[PDB]
Each structure stands twice: as structure tokens, then as C-alpha cells.
């Protein structure tokens, strides 16, 4: 029994907000779905503003875990009987599942549209039938751009208590998925506590634990070890697996002249094994067997980019695109077995090289959802790689990337702590939303408009309440003007009362009456 | 005599770096120029890495001020005699000045190319002949993307001591220009201390002090008051003036349906005056008289964007582009009198609307340098507008914007302090450099490559030394691994020794021998 400690409350993080749920009925089953959202309560006759909410159920004892909200859905489908358990299988049969309706409601889009996007491979709903605690969400270019937060220990740092805190904290600030990338002690146990306490999808990179199972000797990996690890993780409820099946033996020499070589953790492990034996990647060789596992649980496959560029110098090189071509082949093969797929992308990429990345992925991978690590647009600022990569992530998101893997201020430096997790999630929520606006995604600008209206009207508390991080905005304002009266003042300390342009506009318009 | 206190030393901010100067001779005059740069001293047989340096002369008593390095240049040109004193006038005569050669050396480009860019109006060298302390720099699309830091007091906050600290601090971290936007007490005096202690160009918005001269009553402004303010500021050495001469009477009603109205400080002041009298903007009316002042000192004109959008809702609206059209007219008129010009741009602009901004400016303003405030790509994150705008600034910089006005974490909330100044400069140096890479600017990637080589080779101290903010990178790494031995370890706490991909690549390549 770990010594779990609670994260700050929803109310402390989001003053004037309440957690709400929209109730809808899944017509085929009669199941009632409670789809979460938040409501920001405003002043001055403004209607309350409703926003997305990933924070999940609050104040739940981590020793007990979250309610198993999906239980009746899974039980009913098992009793009906089915050859495959994936959302893509159901979508292709013409079935709108509870998960699809839940996502449609959450996205304010039609359930049939969700079904269509899943059936055609252009969106995924990562939702292992063993992750009963999950509040379903959808990843795809036609939907809100989503953010992943990476957490997990290393052999050098952290603990079970701290990782559970970090999952709850990441989702509080807007993480849409998390991955447990633990490479230290207690891998299985850490992940069990996380899954039972995570309302968002949980991904892993199974080769990390496989390498642990063989005591860090990559040469002792093989398909059988890996297969056992896949089953173990699937049984716990992992919703998606990153698998570097595109790191082919013949692609490894393409990296010999790179400045930063192979920077992918899983990719480097596969490359070492391949070179040791001069054999083809065992995950590639056994792709069909991996698909058979995924079909029984609905584990989505996130096809890794083990040959992603780790420096600006290496961006968009032959190695990177050789792997992308193979990811497309693997994607099409997975779809033949109705397995949900997304593709992992770069990396360190300068801005002028970003469009080529999207163009090639959309074509070669038949519009499967893309999932990028940034990209970082420059190598010059370790300590600020949440900013160097927010630029790339926003750009590639605007071009169609569906899931943005965050990058924290600790990238290239060390394991992120709870503060770094928050900073990364905030930076990535900015990038994702900026991308939603650039895509003219329906109703995305309503958020900006509500905050800007509060800004123009000097409804300061409303402005703070509507923001991504209300207490930061409020505290920053109060550093110079802390008095209650200033929360209704028609200026702040930047310009002062006589130089505030919005107050001058106010008088300008008043005189125009 | 203010109680000036020193900023942290160059050595504390940039370990392993030295300040250096490249000596070149201005052939026409025989004047010897000492053009600053920094040198980062590296290990492992790497050559030292030379980078740009805006920090200026160090450890100089602010009561005494910087050396008047340009004195002999100005004195010689006065003795030769000239009708106009601007770099554009000299460039059009076919003269390569000390300023042009200094900039060429600093940019590693040909002096004739600098002259050509200035003569054609596509670059400016803001360099008032009364700012003798200035180390010349150039702003233009063909050059490194530059960053401006805004400082100054308000009626509500700050002091002379703190503003001088902030100028030295901003330039330490990479600010290429600063503006003294003081709207409180001691405007003249604050600016005098800043100019005498600033090695970078100093800009102002003269209407702010003009409004102060009439006790905050905009209706008591007029050309004469404004003219007196221009002369006062020019005499001190201000290198450029933001003047909102494109805020025309007939454009003001175009803002009536805006969500956030007129958010420009100077623009709102001009609009109030125009509406009060139903008269044309006096700065527009007296444009020719402003040009006559600028020609005697070489003050560059930064044509304001008083109708810039202050919310995503207002982006790229009729008001904004009406003003842009007028900025082009004003630009061409200024060039007829050989006055150097840049144009100010937005603002709050979603990413998909950024290209239109650049396309219109390049055409309508005949490729004059563009100077943007961001743009902010979303309104949702006050407290993090250095990040929301770094995205926009990088994008618009990649498309050709020459000067990026920073935005600090205090934007929309209060007056930035010294910490916020650093944060804004860092974010903007990232955006500017990312833009340099996207433009494939010569030798820009050498910086990224040097840091990435140090990263791959586990030369940790070199990696930190090469970064934008060495002590942040070092401290962050040391939070988990503080021991000296870890500075040569082939891993960090993110992956640990057995999962470090670069170490695995290392072994992979070693085995390949
Ligand atoms: N335990 C953990 N917690 C948080 N992020 C992790 C993590 N383990 C791995 N990651 C993420 O996975 C990455 C792989 S290790 C280094 C990756 C390299 N910088 C690159 O460009 O790809 C880390 O940088 C981090 O982004
Ligand atoms: N004294 C000062 N110190 C630092 N920045 C200042 C400043 N005075 C003005 N500024 C800058 O000038 C801006 C004008 S006031 C508000 C501008 C508004 N947010 C907009 O979108 O245009 C400030 O937001 C800040 O960016
Ligand atoms: O094992 P590697 O380094 O490839 O993966 C590290 C992390 O990076 C994420 N990622 C995303 C895109 N490319 C990589 C991936 O999902 C996992 O979270
Ligand atoms: O008076 P206004 O608000 O226009 O200008 C505020 C600041 O913003 C800068 N700016 C840059 C582009 N548009 C505006 C301008 O140079 C000055 O630093
Ligand atoms: S004083 Fe300036 S920064 Fe503050 S609310 Fe008014 S316009 Fe915005
Ligand atoms: S351990 Fe991981 S994060 Fe640290 S240097 Fe190695 S690859 Fe980079
Ligand atoms: Cl690294
Ligand atoms: Cl504001
Ligand atoms: Zn990296
Ligand atoms: Zn603004």
C-alpha cells in the first residue's frame, strides 16, 4: 500500500468552474452515458461557458480506484458474442458503440460521423476492454487535437506515489492520454495503480518492460519474451502500445552518418537486437501475431518511429522516411484485421521541413492518425523545449496531426517532476488549441471569444476563470495590483489608468452613443 | 543619482563563454571598428563556437555611462558636410558607412549587400547620431531575425533603477533592441539613463510622453506638442519612433463592431483625439514635418499599427488592413526623403491567418521591414502569452518578419518585472532562431549542430555552455543528478544507464567498427 497523497482540488485549480456531465442514452443497449464537461460560471449576464474536461472523477481513494463505468457495456457485448473486440471491427459492422456515442457527445459531433471515421481508419478510440475506468475519447484529424503526457519512473528517479500523483495532475491540466514509460523498479505494479486510477487512455511501450524481464540484455530479447509482455500489459487494461516494428534491419545502416544517431529508446533497443543477430525486427516478423492479441482486448497500435530525428541536422533524412513507408505497410496490414492504428512521428524538425512530414504521412499511411513528439523546431534551448516544441506541435497540428506528445522543460536533461508535467501540459494545450483554431474546428474560437470579451469588459475574475491556468493568471495580475478593488478596475499595472487602451476605447464608444 | 545595482555578470550567465571583438577597418575613414561576438570554449577537440552578442560592454558604472564609440564617425561625417544624416541617404549615394560595415561584419555578410538592402528600403540600421554608445545592428528579412524587449515604468509600478537593470538584463539574454515605453514619472530622466547605458538601439512611442506633457488629456494634444516631444527625444538619441500615423479618422468607425476594440495604446490616444475634434490624425497631416526631423538625426520611423487586432475574433479585419494600406503610403513618402522605415504588425492572429498578413505587408509596403507583436495564436492562456505568441512570432518570422517584439508572461496582466523580461527574451530568441532555420539563413544551423554534437557525445558542460540559458539547463539536469561525475555520464535520469538511446547507439556504432 503506497503512501498516496492527494493532488490539489479541482476547485483550487479552476475557481468558478464546476464538473458536469451530459447524459445521453445509447439506444441499442439502453445504457445511460454520463459524458464529462466543465462549466465556467461567469458574471455580468454572460451564459456559463462549457469546456472539455479530462480531469476525471475527483477525491477518489487511490487504494480503491475509479468506478468501473464501462462494465455493463463490455459485459453486454461479451454476452452477445463477437469474433473481434475492437472499435474498428464494430464500426465496420455498422455498429455505433457506447464508446462512439460517448466520444461523439464529448466532441459535439454526430455518432455516425464518429463511426465512419473509426471504420475508415482516420480516427481511433483507444479503449481496452479491461480498462473499465476509462472515460472514452477519440483521436483523429476531424476531432479536437489531443495531448499526451508521458510519465513513469526511471532506475534513477521517482516512485509509485509520485507517478500516480503525476497522472492525476497531468489530467487535471488537460492531458487527453497518458503513457506510463516506467523503466525502473515495480513496472507492473506502478502501471496497475495508474490504470485503476486513470480516467484517460493509458499507453505503454512494451519493449521497455520486455528489456527489464531480461535484465537489460537486449540480445536476450525475442518474440516470445515480447509476446508475454504484450499479454501481461493487455490484461491490465493498457489502451495502446507503441511498437517499433518499422525499425527494419536494412534501415539501421541509414543512421550511420547521423549527428545524433538513434534517439528513440525502443528503436535503439530493437536496432541493437537486430545488429546482434543480423535478423529482421521480431515485432515486424510477428506483426500478424501482435494483431491477434490486439483483437481480443482492443489494444490500439501506435506504430513507433524508432528512426525519428533527434537533432535538426538529422531531420527528414532517408532513415526517417524509410521507416515511415514501412509504418504505412504495417497500418494497412493492421486494418485488414480491424486493429486500430495511429502512427508516431518526429522529433526534431525545423519549421520549413514540417509540411513534408505531414504530406508524406497522409499519403503513405492512408490518413491514419499521426502522433508527434513535438516536433522541436531548434536544438538551442534545453530547459525550454516545451517552447521550442510547442511551435512545432502547433504547426504540425494545424496540418492535421491528431495527437501531440508533450515535451517538458526537462527534455534532454532529466526525469520530469510534477511541476514539469504541468508546464508541459499547459504548453501543449496551447499548441493543440492554436491548431484547432487554424483548422477552423467548429466552436473552437468560442473559448477565445469568451475570454477576450471578459478582458475587454474588465471582468477580471471571469477572465482568469476562463483561462487554461486560472490561478497563475490571477496571481500574476495580483503581484502589482493585489487589492480586491483592482479586480473591477478598468486598467492594470501595465499601462495604468490613464494609458489603458481598452478603457480609452470604452470612452471612445461611450461618446459615440 | 539613482541607486543602480549591477546585473549578474556575463560569466555567471554564460559559463565557458568569453566576450570578443572582430576588428575591421572602415576603408574610407580609416576608422577601426570592434564588432562584438561571443566565443563558447568547448572540450574534446571541438573548435570554439562563435555566436552573436548583444550584451554590450560589461561592468560599466551606470553613473558614467558607456563609451561613445561612434563619436569619430559622426564627427567626421559632420565635417565633410551632408544634407541628410540617414543611413538610407548615405546608402543611396553609394556610401558604405561605418554602421553598414559594422552590421555586415556582425552578420557575416558583404558590406555592399548591407548598403543595397538599406538603399532599397528592405533593411534599416536604427542609429540616431546622438546615440554614440550604440553598437550598430541591422533589421531586415535578409538578416538574422531580431528581437525587441519592451521595458519602462507605468504610473502604478517600477523605478529608474529597475528599468536600467531591465535594459542591461534584456540585452544580456539576447534582446537586439529595446523600447522605453515609460508612461509614469520621470520619463525624460529614465530614458536618458537608459540611452547612455544602452549598447543596443532604443525606441520609443513619442505620443506617450506627449500625452504626459498635457496631463493625460488627449484633447489637449496637437501637432505642436507632438513636434516638441519628437525633438526632445531625438536630441537624447532615440533610434526609432513608433508613430501611429495610419490611424485615420475614417478608419475609426471600422472598429465599432470589434470584440476588443482598439488595444493599441498610442492608437487609442490618436483615435480619441480624432473623434474629439472630427479631424484627421495630426501625425498623418504632418508626416512631411516628421520626416524633416528624422533626417537631421537619423531617427528611423516604426509606423505603428494602432488598429491591430487585440483578440482572435478581430484578426485580419477591415480596420487592420485599412491601416496597413496607409502604412504603405507613408512608407513610400518617407523613402522619398530618405528616412528609414519599418512597419508594425499584429497582434492576436490565429495561425491560418498569418500568411495573409505577410503577403499583404510585403506587397502593400514594398518589402519594408515588418515588426510584429507576436502574434499571439490564441487568447486562452494569460500567464503564458510568451508561449502563445512564440508560436506566432516563429511563424511570421519564417515568412519574412524582421523584428519580433517580445511578449512576456505578464502580457494582459501587469507590468513585466526583471524575471519576466528574461522569460520573454528567451522565448523570442527561440522564435527568432527557429525562423532563421526555416529561412535556411546561412550558418544558422551551426549552432544547433554544435549543441547536438555535444549532446550525442555526452559533453554535458559543453551542451549547457552552448545553450540560450546555460545555468537553467545545468541546474535542471542537476536536480536529479548533481554529482560532478554525472557531467561525463553516458545517460541522465530520464532513461537511466540501461535505457539511454544515445548510449545504445554508441555501442551499436562501436560494434560496427
Ligand atoms: N519516464 C518518463 N517520464 C516522462 N517522459 C519520458 C519518460 N521516459 C521517456 N520519456 C519521453 O520519451 C523520450 C525518449 S528518451 C530521449 C528522446 C530524445 N530527446 C528524442 O528526441 O527523441 C524522452 O525524451 C521523453 O520525451
Ligand atoms: N512599460 C512597459 N513595459 C513592458 N511592456 C510594455 C510596457 N508598456 C507597454 N508594453 C507593451 O505594449 C503593449 C500595449 S498595452 C496592451 C496591448 C494589447 N494586449 C495588445 O494586444 O496589443 C503591452 O501589452 C506590452 O506588450
Ligand atoms: O521509445 P521511444 O523513444 O520511441 O518513445 C518515447 C515516447 O515518445 C512518444 N512518441 C511520440 C511520437 N514519437 C514518439 C512515444 O509514444 C513514447 O511516449
Ligand atoms: O502603442 P502601441 O500599443 O501600439 O505599441 C506598444 C508596443 O508594441 C510594439 N508593437 C510592435 C508591433 N506592434 C506593436 C510597439 O513597438 C511598442 O513597443
Ligand atoms: S492597462 Fe494595458 S495591459 Fe492592462 S488592461 Fe489596460 S490595455 Fe490591457
Ligand atoms: S538518458 Fe534519455 S534523456 Fe538522458 S541523455 Fe540518454 S537519451 Fe537523452
Ligand atoms: Cl537526450
Ligand atoms: Cl490587455
Ligand atoms: Zn530530443
Ligand atoms: Zn493583447
Amino acid at each position: 500500500s503506497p503512501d498516496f497523497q492527494p493532488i490539489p482540488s479541482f476547485e483550487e485549480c479552476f475557481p468558478k468552474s464546476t464538473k458536469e456531465h451530459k447524459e445521453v442514452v445509447h439506444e441499442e443497449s439502453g445504457h445511460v452515458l454520463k459524458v464529462p464537461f466543465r462549466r465556467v460560471h461567469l458574471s455580468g449576464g454572460e451564459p456559463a461557458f462549457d469546456n472539455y474536461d479530462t480531469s476525471g472523477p475527483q477525491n477518489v481513494n487511490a487504494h480503491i480506484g475509479l468506478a468501473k463505468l464501462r462494465k455493463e457495456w463490455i459485459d453486454r457485448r461479451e454476452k452477445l458474442g463477437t469474433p473481434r473486440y475492437t472499435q474498428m471491427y464494430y464500426a465496420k459492422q455498422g455498429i455505433i458503440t457506447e464508446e462512439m456515442l460517448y466520444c461523439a457527445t464529448r466532441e459535439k459531433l454526430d455518432p455516425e460521423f464518429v463511426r465512419s471515421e473509426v471504420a475508415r481508419g482516420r480516427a481511433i478510440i483507444p479503449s481496452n476492454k479491461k480498462h473499465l475506468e476509462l472515460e472514452p475519447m477519440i483521436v483523429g484529424r476531424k476531432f479536437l487535437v489531443k495531448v499526451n503526457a508521458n510519465i513513469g519512473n526511471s532506475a534513477v528517479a521517482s516512485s509509485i506515489e509520485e507517478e500516480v500523483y503525476k497522472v492525476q495532475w497531468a489530467t487535471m491540466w488537460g492531458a487527453d492520454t497518458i503513457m506510463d514509460l516506467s523503466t525502473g523498479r515495480h513496472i507492473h505494479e506502478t502501471r496497475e495503480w495508474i490504470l485503476r486510477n486513470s480516467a484517460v487512455p493509458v499507453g505503454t511501450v512494451p519493449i521497455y518492460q520486455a528489456l527489464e524481464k531480461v535484465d537489460g540484455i537486449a540480445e536476450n530479447l525475442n518474440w516470445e519474451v515480447f509476446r508475454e509482455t504484450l499479454i501481461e500489459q493487455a490484461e491490465q487494461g493498457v489502451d495502446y502500445f507503441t511498437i517499433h516494428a518499422g525499425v527494419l534491419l536494412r534501415y539501421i545502416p541509414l543512421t550511420a552518418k547521423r549527428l545524433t544517431g538513434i534517439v528513440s529508446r525502443g528503436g535503439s533497443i530493437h536496432a541493437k537486437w537486430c545488429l546482434a543477430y543480423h535478423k529482421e525486427n521480431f515485432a515486424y516478423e510477428h506483426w500478424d501475431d501482435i494483431l491477434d492479441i490486439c483483437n481480443q482486448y482492443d489494444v490500439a497500435l501506435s506504430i513507433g518511429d524508432g528512426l525519428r530525428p533527434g537533432s535538426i541536422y538529422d531531420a527528414n533524412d532517408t532513415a526517417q522516411f524509410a521507416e515511415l513507408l514501412t509504418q504505412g505497410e504495417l497500418t494497412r496490414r493492421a486494418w485488414e484485421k480491424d486493429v486500430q492504428v495511429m502512427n508516431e512521428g518526429p522529433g526534431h524538425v525545423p519549421m520549413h521541413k514540417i509540411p513534408e512530414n505531414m504530406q508524406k504521412q497522409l499519403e503513405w499511411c492512408n490518413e491514419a492518425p499521426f502522433y508527434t513528439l513535438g516536433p522541436l523546431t531548434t536544438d538551442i534551448a534545453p530547459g525550454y523545449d516545451h517552447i521550442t516544441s510547442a511551435i512545432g506541435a502547433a504547426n504540425i497540428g494545424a496540418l492535421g496531426t491528431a495527437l501531440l506528445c508533450y515535451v517538458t522543460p526537462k527534455e534532454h536533461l532529466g526525469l520530469p517532476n510534477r511541476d514539469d508535467v504541468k508546464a508541459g501540459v499547459i504548453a501543449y494545450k496551447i499548441a493543440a488549441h492554436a491548431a484547432d483554431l487554424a483548422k477552423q474546428h467548429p466552436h473552437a474560437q468560442a473559448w477565445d471569444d469568451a475570454l477576450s470579451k471578459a478582458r475587454f469588459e474588465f471582468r477580471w475574475m471571469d477572465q482568469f476563470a476562463l483561462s487554461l491556468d486560472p490561478m497563475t493568471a490571477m496571481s500574476f495580475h495580483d503581484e502589482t495590483l493585489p487589492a480586491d478593488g483592482a479586480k473591477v478596475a478598468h486598467f492594470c499595472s501595465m499601462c495604468g489608468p490613464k494609458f489603458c487602451s481598452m478603457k480609452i476605447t470604452e470612452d471612445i464608444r461611450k461618446y459615440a452613443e
Side-chain angles (χ1 to χ4, degrees), chain A residues 2-509 512-513:
Chain A
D3 184 25
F4 296 123
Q5 290 307 298
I7 60 164
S9 70
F10 181 88
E11 289 69 36
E12 286 173 303
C13 296
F14 299 107
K16 298 160 61 64
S17 290
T18 55
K19 284 185 63 82
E20 306 292 338
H21 298 79
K22 178 167 175 52
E23 291 181 11
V24 294
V25 174
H26 181 250
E27 290 190 10
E28 188 198 1
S29 68
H31 293 151
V32 176
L33 317 186
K34 299 179 185 179
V35 184
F37 68 99
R38 61 181 65 206
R39 176 163 288 166
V40 189
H41 301 266
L42 303 178
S43 71
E46 295 302 312
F49 182 77
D50 292 339
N51 213 341
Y52 205 94
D53 183 18
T54 52
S55 66
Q58 298 291 301
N59 302 315
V60 178
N61 189 335
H63 295 95
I64 293 156
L66 300 179
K68 296 185 174 60
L69 75 92
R70 298 175 63 212
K71 185 177 162 50
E72 68 184 356
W73 313 354
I74 298 312
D75 288 350
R76 172 182 168 274
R77 295 200 293 257
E78 179 62 31
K79 285 194 170 204
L80 289 169
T82 185
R84 293 177 176 163
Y85 289 85
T86 70
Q87 296 293 318
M88 174 177 276
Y89 169 76
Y90 298 127
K92 285 178 176 179
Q93 308 323 295
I95 298 166
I96 295 171
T97 61
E98 292 90 335
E99 289 82 356
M100 291 166 202
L101 173 62
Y102 198 106
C103 290
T105 305
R106 212 171 180 180
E107 296 275 338
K108 296 184 295 179
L109 292 171
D110 194 276
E112 160 62 18
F113 179 72
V114 167
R115 189 211 54 78
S116 180
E117 290 295 301
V118 174
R120 75 195 296 155
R122 192 158 66 185
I124 63 170
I125 301 176
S127 52
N128 182 325
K129 71 188 193 183
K130 311 294 189 181
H131 190 185
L132 296 174
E133 300 83 0
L134 172 67
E135 296 175 341
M137 59 82 78
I138 187 160
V139 171
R141 181 180 185 193
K142 295 296 185 175
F143 301 96
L144 291 164
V145 178
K146 302 308 193 305
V147 173
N148 175 76
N150 283 331
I151 55 82
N153 66 36
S154 78
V156 186
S158 208
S159 67
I160 294 180
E161 292 87 344
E162 197 37 51
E163 298 308 317
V164 172
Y165 185 106
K166 283 155 70 181
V167 172
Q168 299 180 313
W169 197 226
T171 58
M172 180 61 72
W173 298 108
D176 301 284
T177 72
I178 66 103
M179 302 187 74
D180 179 356
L181 302 187
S182 293
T183 57
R185 298 179 56 85
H186 306 137
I187 291 170
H188 182 98
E189 296 97 324
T190 298
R191 184 171 57 235
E192 184 70 20
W193 286 112
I194 288 173
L195 277 160
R196 307 283 74 87
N197 287 288
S198 181
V200 306
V202 174
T204 59
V205 188
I207 200 70
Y208 302 170
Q209 190 183 0
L211 182 62
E212 191 266 356
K213 288 190 184 301
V214 298
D215 298 317
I217 307 181
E219 292 85 356
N220 288 339
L221 290 167
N222 47 62
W223 163 243
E224 174 62 19
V225 172
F226 192 59
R227 186 190 68 84
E228 284 172 318
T229 304
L230 300 178
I231 296 167
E232 176 189 337
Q233 300 191 1
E235 289 289 334
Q236 294 181 275
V238 171
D239 297 296
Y240 65 93
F241 292 150
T242 299
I243 299 185
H244 303 87
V247 176
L248 306 189
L249 175 60
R250 69 188 178 272
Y251 296 165
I252 302 169
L254 302 177
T255 69
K257 300 305 186 293
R258 281 182 155 198
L259 183 59
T260 49
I262 298 176
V263 294
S264 168
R265 185 186 290 162
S268 69
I269 293 163
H270 283 278
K272 188 176 176 173
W273 182 94
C274 288
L275 293 185
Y277 291 111
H278 202 72
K279 288 190 60 209
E280 190 55 278
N281 185 311
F282 55 78
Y284 180 83
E285 294 291 80
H286 286 270
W287 194 240
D288 282 12
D289 297 329
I290 292 168
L291 305 177
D292 291 336
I293 292 163
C294 294
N295 258 330
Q296 292 297 312
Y297 299 84
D298 201 355
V299 186
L301 291 175
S302 190
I303 309 181
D305 67 335
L307 306 182
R308 71 172 175 273
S311 58
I312 295 297
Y313 183 95
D314 295 333
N316 294 30
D317 73 352
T318 306
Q320 178 188 339
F321 288 140
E323 179 177 46
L324 181 64
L325 199 64
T326 295
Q327 292 174 274
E329 173 211 331
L330 296 168
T331 297
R332 288 182 296 274
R333 287 172 63 186
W335 287 348
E336 289 180 352
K337 292 209 189 172
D338 302 328
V339 173
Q340 297 192 88
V341 176
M342 59 180 172
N343 307 143
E344 300 199 357
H348 295 227
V349 183
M351 281 180 303
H352 63 304
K353 284 185 169 180
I354 291 175
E356 178 184 20
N357 278 281
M358 199 78 216
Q359 188 280 318
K360 283 179 161 64
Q361 190 273 340
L362 287 164
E363 185 185 340
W364 296 356
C365 302
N366 293 74
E367 303 181 80
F370 203 28
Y371 178 18
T372 53
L373 183 58
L376 280 75
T377 57
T378 172
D379 299 333
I380 69 167
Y384 300 89
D385 282 327
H386 59 310
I387 303 180
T388 67
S389 70
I391 298 166
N395 280 23
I396 212 163
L399 300 179
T401 294
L403 185 60
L404 301 174
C405 191
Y406 84 176
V407 175
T408 77
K410 293 298 175 52
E411 188 78 0
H412 309 110
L413 303 170
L415 194 74
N417 63 43
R418 55 176 62 174
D419 298 341
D420 306 320
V421 172
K422 178 177 177 187
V425 174
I426 295 303
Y428 272 68
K429 284 292 284 170
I430 290 169
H433 183 74
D436 293 330
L437 295 174
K439 293 162 69 188
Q440 299 183 71
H441 192 81
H443 309 299
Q445 196 186 300
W447 187 355
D448 304 75
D449 294 349
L451 190 152
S452 286
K453 193 178 192 288
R455 174 166 293 153
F456 183 70
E457 294 174 353
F458 300 105
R459 289 183 284 108
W460 286 101
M461 292 301 298
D462 288 352
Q463 181 189 158
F464 306 148
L466 286 163
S467 73
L468 269 181
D469 181 7
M471 298 303 291
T472 289
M474 190 184 90
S475 181
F476 281 11
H477 171 273
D478 292 357
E479 288 178 23
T480 49
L481 294 178
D484 293 346
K487 300 297 199 306
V488 300
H490 292 217
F491 63 94
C492 74
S493 68
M494 177 77 79
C495 307
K498 299 199 278 79
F499 290 85
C500 179
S501 62
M502 294 187 309
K503 194 270 183 305
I504 292 164
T505 294
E506 175 187 346
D507 298 345
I508 274 175
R509 292 182 174 184
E513 293 182 21

